[PDB]
Design a protein around this ligand. Sequence first.
Ligand code: HEM
Ligand code: HEM
Ligand code: HEM
Lengths: 154, 154, 154, 154, 154, 154
Amino acid sequence: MKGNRDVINQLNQVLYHHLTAINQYFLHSRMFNDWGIEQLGSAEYKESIRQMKHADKIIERILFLEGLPNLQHLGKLYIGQHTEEVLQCDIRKVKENIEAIQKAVALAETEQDYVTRDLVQEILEKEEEYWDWLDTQIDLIGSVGIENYIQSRM
Amino acid sequence: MKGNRDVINQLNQVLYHHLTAINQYFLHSRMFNDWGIEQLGSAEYKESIRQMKHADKIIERILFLEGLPNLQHLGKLYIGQHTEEVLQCDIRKVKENIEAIQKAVALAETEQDYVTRDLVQEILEKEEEYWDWLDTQIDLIGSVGIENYIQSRM
Amino acid sequence: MKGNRDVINQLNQVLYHHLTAINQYFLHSRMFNDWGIEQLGSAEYKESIRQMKHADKIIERILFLEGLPNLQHLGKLYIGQHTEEVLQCDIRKVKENIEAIQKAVALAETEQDYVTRDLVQEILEKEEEYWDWLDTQIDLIGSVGIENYIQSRM
Amino acid sequence: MKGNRDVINQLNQVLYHHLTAINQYFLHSRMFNDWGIEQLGSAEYKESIRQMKHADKIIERILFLEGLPNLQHLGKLYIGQHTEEVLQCDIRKVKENIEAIQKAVALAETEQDYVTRDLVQEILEKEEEYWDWLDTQIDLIGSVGIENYIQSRM
Amino acid sequence: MKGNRDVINQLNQVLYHHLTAINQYFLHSRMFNDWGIEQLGSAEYKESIRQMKHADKIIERILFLEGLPNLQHLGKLYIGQHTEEVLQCDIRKVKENIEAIQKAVALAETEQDYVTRDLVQEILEKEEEYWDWLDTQIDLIGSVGIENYIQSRM
Amino acid sequence: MKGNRDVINQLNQVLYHHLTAINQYFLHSRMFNDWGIEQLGSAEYKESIRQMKHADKIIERILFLEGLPNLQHLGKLYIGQHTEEVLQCDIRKVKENIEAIQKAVALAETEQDYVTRDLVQEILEKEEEYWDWLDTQIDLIGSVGIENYIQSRM
Ligand code: HEM
Ligand code: HEM
Ligand code: HEM
């Protein structure tokens, strides 16, 4: 293939994690909506769409490199049963995403696939943003209490 | 739970097929784009998005009925290696979708879940449309030849 | 020089307090934002910008009077560790600002620098407004409780 | 000079390749137009202009670094005599561009000229895009036949 | 903290230099205006605002990494007494900025904080732009003479 | 071939001079910009683009006449080291351009290639305009002095 095989394999790992995140965040969105917590339903939906866009770019990059995108398998979904637990499940997932993306950055650099590096660098910045937003929600549950926090996210 | 357990379980079967169809069709879109056959890339993307909307509607219906939507599992993706084979892989997938939807209609009717029936009846109408479109593409390959057919779908 | 030396020196005292207030308020803004308390982040940003405009007006007045604006030095920043303490740190800072401004008004009047007096009198009016706003926030924390107060300032 | 001499020398190599590509793609554009294959005439023109823009940015970067941009010499032009051969000649050229750009990225990194690195990283992404487009045209000539392919590019 | 401690410390160094540059350029702006050299007053103001924006992004990045932004201290201000000397003082300052930013890029890379790296890479590009503009003004004073140069910058 | 071989060969001589002029003028533009003399940067850019359009028209004319445009070779670039020398280098280049164009007009007339003659006659009119502009700049340097002249072209 035109691309580096090891780079292609790690891009498929990143895709695996994006595919997993799409489904986790999407179900979390619809669970929050079913509960009437509509603003967190929206935030989870937006991040699900963001993950879908990430996956699209990785698939297209893998195909350009003449590799085979792997959409057949998923990782473990972390599904919470109440608001605070959902947030902690998302935190667990985004940390997995970031670790995989960081290793893709490091590997692309070593193999001199600089365009791939910049692609996953762009995704990483957004994953840090979602991690930050989740951390903030946890702290706010601490500051205002879970009853006030949910009320605010209706 | 408020909904019927067998109806709930068959809705998760329909969701499984939609989630699987999402990934098959989306990959086929990007492969057609990778091959330079952009009108088939676009058609496949549109059908993937429709499957995404179908899955959304089913997830929301399962949650209202107080069941647990299952997004953890995926079926076999039928991935083609050239234009004609891709179309045949899609035909195989939509036939699986339609069969699961038909059993959901029949079962929803029996259990007097008339609102679920109407939801899955609407999805069925769209699945028949995609099936018809695929049949037409295969016939057109026969009528005009694969070289003219691909040329037309650039 | 064309201006009065004591007036010039007290204007640099006012500038010192504005420069210090810029940094305290700006950091408090970004800390509130980091905590998810965005309306207090916004209020603190607005007051930092006002302090930036105050400092600008004083610098321009010192230069017209042919003195040397001193931007090299900073006072103690009072940095809080939670919402209520931040507000109290700001109250301490604005009280220092107002005291320096009041001495500038009194001294400008004595030395018949009536244009400088009016400049610092305008700044004072705005500093009293920020002081009033801070007092109100503290009272509101008392009336509604810190959990409701923070919830409201998200 | 303010810049690193070795970095400057490699930037002049990249410029050499951009200057060469401008002329190859431009002549190919006008040859396709002379043949009546106007859509490939347009694609070659757009890429010629893109190469001109690349050259502009490299020249300006070399001058900022206090080096001497070398516009006096050109590399070998690969000029095809029929559609498929033209595409293969462009593929040969873009591969030369990318190799020179990749070595510029690697060298800028080692010498800690991070702004130069980002400049050539941006160009590289576009060169990969043109390489991809060319690969696609070759495959389409395979899929639809050269007679249909040219017809489509009129 | 979630961030790397050494990266956080170097980000605080970059902030230190941005805080210093804000004040130097701002005073230089108002000094040029006091002298009637309004176009250089404007250029210094714009760059002061640019430095303020740089500082904002670094503060927010430090807080995201769970570090403590240090706004309490400033570096030495280089304040000129006539047009050419002001420009040379700014040149001294921007070189300090760039050295600190380059070491932040190198350190972020080593510790695999790739989003921080991209943030300071973006700032660096702008600092090179201001350095270039300053170099140009010095040369123009050489070409046209200081009397013509100031006249032009009124 | 459909065109006259000697006419075809002289058209390639004109193209050679345009391609050479493109590069000289474009570099002069970016050098003037690098020096802060932006109105001369702009004037030189405009003349480079005109030379690019001239080269395009000649390439298209050679191809219609079924000859082979030669873009592989370049003449001596006359690169100045200061404003006055640059202008003199441009004067030398446009004089070469005009001489090649004049021989193309005379030869096209002899061989009754009246359409080619009119094409090169139009280009000549524009080359005389650039020659006139350059002469004016040199005279203006004499009338106002180089320091005022450069000041005016900032
Ligand atoms: C499996 C990999 C998937 C990929 C690559 C993918 C890709 C995309 C893309 C590219 C878009 C358009 C984004 C935009 O234009 O703003 C989109 C939209 C959407 N996706 Fe997905 N998607 C995936 C899975 C899913 C799943 C599993 C669901 C539901 C559980 C879903 C639900 C949606 C919805 C509801 C939309 C909005 C469509 C619209 O309103 O137009 N997606 N997806
Ligand atoms: C000390 C760190 C500072 C930071 C982080 C900071 C930050 C900012 C920011 C983020 C803006 C808005 C920029 C925009 O939206 O375009 C701004 C504007 C401004 N700053 Fe600062 N600033 C600082 C210090 C100063 C100082 C010391 C002065 C005066 C000597 C100053 C004078 C101004 C002025 C006059 C404006 C324009 C405000 C307006 O017209 O809306 N700043 N600053
Ligand atoms: C040799 C190095 C060259 C450089 C750095 C260069 C640079 C440029 C630039 C910066 C533009 C404007 C792009 C834009 O604003 O969109 C341009 C336009 C153009 N160039 Fe070049 N160019 C070069 C050579 C050539 C050559 C050799 C030709 C012809 C064979 C050519 C033909 C054109 C044409 C036809 C245009 C469009 C101008 C217009 O319609 O405004 N260029 N070039």
